[PDB]
Amino acid sequence: GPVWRKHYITYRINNYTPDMNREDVDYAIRKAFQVWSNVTPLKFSKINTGMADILVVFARGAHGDDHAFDGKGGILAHAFGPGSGIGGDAHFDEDEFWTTHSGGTNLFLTAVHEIGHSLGLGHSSDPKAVMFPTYKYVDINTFRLSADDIRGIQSLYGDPKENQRLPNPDNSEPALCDPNLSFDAVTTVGNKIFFFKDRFFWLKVSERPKTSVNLISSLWPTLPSGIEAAYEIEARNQVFLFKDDKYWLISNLRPEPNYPKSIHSFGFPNFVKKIDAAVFNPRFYRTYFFVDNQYWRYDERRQMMDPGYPKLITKNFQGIGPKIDAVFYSKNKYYYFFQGSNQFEYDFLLQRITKTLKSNSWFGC
Ligand SMILES: [Ca+2]
Ligand SMILES: [Ca+2]
Ligand SMILES: [Ca+2]
Numbered sequence: 001g002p003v004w005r006k007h008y009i010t011y012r013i014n015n016y017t018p019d020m021n022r023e024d025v026d027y028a029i030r031k032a033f034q035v036w037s038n039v040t041p042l043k044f045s046k047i048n049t050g051m052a053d054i055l056v057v058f059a060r061g062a063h064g065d066d067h068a069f070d071g072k073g074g075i076l077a078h079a080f081g082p083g084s085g086i087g088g089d090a091h092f093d094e095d096e097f098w099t100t101h102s103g104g105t106n107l108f109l110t111a112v113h114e115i116g117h118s119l120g121l122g123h124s125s126d127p128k129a130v131m132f133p134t135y136k137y138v139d140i141n142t143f144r145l146s147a148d149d150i151r152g153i154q155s156l157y158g159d160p161k162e163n164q165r166l167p168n169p170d171n172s173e174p175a176l177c178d179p180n181l182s183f184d185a186v187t188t189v190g191n192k193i194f195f196f197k198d199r200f201f202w203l204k205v206s207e208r209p210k211t212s213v214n215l216i217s218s219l220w221p222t223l224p225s226g227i228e229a230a231y232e233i234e235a236r237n238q239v240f241l242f243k244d245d246k247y248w249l250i251s252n253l254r255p256e257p258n259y260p261k262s263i264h265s266f267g268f269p270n271f272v273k274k275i276d277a278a279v280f281n282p283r284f285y286r287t288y289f290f291v292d293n294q295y296w297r298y299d300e301r302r303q304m305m306d307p308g309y310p311k312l313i314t315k316n317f318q319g320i321g322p323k324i325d326a327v328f329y330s331k332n333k334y335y336y337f338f339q340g341s342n343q344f345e346y347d348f349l350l351q352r353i354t355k356t357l358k359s360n361s362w363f364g365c
């Protein structure tokens with residue numbers, strides 16, 4: 001079918017069968033989900049309030065749908081492939097008797113078959129599968145995915161995000177996906193992107209599948225670690241490294257005749273102690289400087305702030321927080337902003353955040 005266009009996904013257990021022990025269903029379920037995330041790059045979260053994205057429900061005969069139930073047997077659950085609205089809900093025929101055991105009609109086994117569906121999978125012609133529609137009421141903590149089901153879950157989603165399997169996946173540090181990966185500064189230099197962090201820098205996007213973090217003292221000479229702001233000027237091979245009241249010019253990875261130097265000879269007041277984010281716009285020939293609260297634009301081709309400058313980041317850039325960690329230019333009319341573990345696709349052409357993404361996306365985790 002289609003599939004879920006999100007790494008992280010929600011469920012809410014909507015109501016409880018009185019075949020009960022609430023808590024046993026929390027489990028049977030929480031756990032059903034687990035089955036899937038354990039072979040699979042997803043997470044699952046039981047929120048208790050607001051509108052979850054997978055919905056478990058226990059209703060009977062005619063419930064809502066157009067696709068009614070039928071009583072004791074035959075259909076026991078149906079769930080809805082992904083899709084807003086009622087897209088991924090898993091529903092359960094209350095006229096059965098659900099169990100932690102294998103008297104009655106197991107809700108571990110059915111919850112899991114039917115979460116797939118919710119998920120994307122059709123059936124498995126595969127007998128051995130946690131469903132050959134023909135529920136194999138089997139032992140319970142030892143049980144596991146017929147390799148088959150593993151394929152089309154895997155077809156649809158991967159194999160999991162850094163090592164070798166079933167067994168499941170681990171979760172690193174300094175890392176490509178601690179999802180609270182913030183930035184010192186960041187830029188691209190002609191077709192790569194340098195991502196700064198303390199002594200670290202991770203580099204690229206460019207057809208190179210995957211991000212290799214390294215120390216900054218290896219590519220870089222006359223310069224400190226821990227880098228606050230940066231941009232580029234692709235037509236002159238220049239990367240500009242900013243920290244504290246001083247900056248560094250660069251070429252071809254090589255520090256042109258003189259640095260560091262001051263930031264003030266570039267122009268600002270002495271009221272200004274540090275540049276926080278910076279981005280150069282070739283469309284129109286200007287650099288954007290960001291001082292917590294406010295910003296400044298430098299006319300590159302004249303060496304001259306344009307008139308009227310400091311300014312107010314939010315008044316002029318719609319919704320970008322009053323402090324910004326990193327900006328950088330998209331080879332075609334955007335700036336991508338990095339405020340916290342957050343980053344914004346920002347169309348500068350009609351000013352509007354248009355995509356909000358995980359601070360760490362081009363490590364397409
Ligand atoms: Ca839903
Ligand atoms: Ca039924
Ligand atoms: Ca019942």
Ligand SMILES: [Ca+2]
Pocket residue numbers: 183184185228229276277324325326
């Ligand atoms: Ca910064």
Ligand SMILES: [Zn+2]
Pocket residue numbers: 063064065067078091
């Ligand atoms: Zn239904």
Ligand SMILES: [Zn+2]
Pocket residue numbers: 113114117123133
């Ligand atoms: Zn089914």
